[PDB]
Amino acid sequence: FGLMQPIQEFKAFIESDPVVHQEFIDMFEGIQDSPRNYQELCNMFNDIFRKAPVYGDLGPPVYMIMAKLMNTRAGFSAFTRQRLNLHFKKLFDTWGLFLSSKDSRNVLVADQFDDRHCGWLNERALSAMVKHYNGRAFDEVFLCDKNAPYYGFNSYDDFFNRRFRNRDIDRPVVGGVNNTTLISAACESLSYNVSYDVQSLDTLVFKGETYSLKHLLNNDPFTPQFEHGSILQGFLNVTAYHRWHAPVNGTIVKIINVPGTYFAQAPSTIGDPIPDNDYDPPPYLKSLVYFSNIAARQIMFIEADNKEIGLIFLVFIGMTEISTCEATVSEGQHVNRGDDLGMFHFGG
Amino acid sequence: XSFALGLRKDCRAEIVEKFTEPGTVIRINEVVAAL
């Protein structure tokens, strides 16, 4: 018994507005398993935010218990209120403090916890994390000490944001850093979508639930330069490297952090089945283009050294509890393709 | 999680074709657009 203070304030907020309160009743209709009501949700949050994630689920822990709620009109309505998302930001920031602490190392173990969950140093998790590294082992790919407790990592966040030990072997800057005509992937990912001739929309309703430049870029003055342009979007799954690399030789022009959503899926998907497996995508993972427009996100404009490439943008797009976007470069700084650019964290 | 790379219409670097198919592996630092 007893809830951490940010959760108590979250619960008070829910009960402060009758319409918000009613959404937090309706979104649970017909639900059989925990969480069955918003009190249980708060209790389960209180446990999740004092633990680190383990390996085995399709997504991180808050997503896993929110997915059914996101998949309702009442949930979507609640989760697209900026007042409520201020609380989610506070909650995930609080969890982030724990995940940066030494206490969060207790999942960086080789233990198997049950049939489907294990510590991040269990062979099942290690192998999953090096699937795309051509047979090299975790401790070859990533900077760590395989002979130290917790592989030498200081926290769950340190492990989450592990670095490459020898990127020239495992993730080379293909074509050579000095070739200014090439643009590299900023994140280790799976392709999600490519759109051409992109435009702005007045509303994010119907219309293929596609990109709207003025939404995505939060009405930046640069937005018109990208009308009729193209966008490549990637998805970083739960085992991917989660740091950002510079995509081009160029200068950081502008960095904008935009408050937004955490649990908003595309409205057209509300009610679709949530598969009970890790290979058939659930509705939220069919919504990445839609919520690129509204999720908590960071926009970064870069002026390439090669002016035939010129001004480009990156948007780092939050997903549920993994929504903190930290740039480690400053406006006006020159970067080369492949350089450290920033990273995602658990947080708001 | 996700990230988006945005290119202007006049950008001579064009997105590499294989990435238009969803689910394709994107190795960080590999080329995703080129002149």
Ligand SMILES: NCCc1c[nH]c2ccccc12
């Ligand atoms: N960034 C790890 C992948 C991730 C974040 N939120 C999710 C929600 C569902 C599935 C995956 C994710």
